[PDB]
Amino acid sequence: ETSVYLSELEWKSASTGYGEIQKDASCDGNTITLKGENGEKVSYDKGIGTHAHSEIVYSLEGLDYYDYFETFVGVDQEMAGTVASISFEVYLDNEKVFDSGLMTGDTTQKHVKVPIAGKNTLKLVVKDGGDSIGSDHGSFGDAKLT
Ligand SMILES: [Ca+2]
Secondary structure, three states: OOOEEHHHOOOOEEEOOOOOOEEOOOOOOOOEEEEOOOOOEEEEOOEEEEEOOEEEEEEOOOOOOOOEEEEEEEEOHHHOOOOOEEEEEEEEOOEEEEEOOOEEOOOOOEEEEEEOOOOOEEEEEEEOOOOOOOOOEEEEEEEEEO
16 A cells, blocks of 8 residues: 555554544544644545544554554544644654644644654554643544555
């Protein structure tokens, strides 16, 4: 495969603040949507939908073929207009490689492209923005190894 969506992979472990970690859907089971730079929604066919506090861990064993982990991140726009407040962190082995800082409902999505050469484990974290988990629907749009 020229690219492998995370939603094709099985995780080593996964926690979430609500429900199921959803493959190719938001945590509420909708098409994943994030806030675009034009103010409008951007919809994603593939991705991972979860809820703060969430930690999802993937082994990269047998996936050393790929150069980058790539995803868009943001508050899932099913929660536009709410108190949603989260941050995204990405780890490769035991170091943080991406940190969005605080993102609320109207915060434009961010793109992640981090190199995975020589790494064995990819960990995705969605934190609760320092308040509560209320409305903390965080989605990884187009999340993939490529
Ligand atoms: Ca929050």
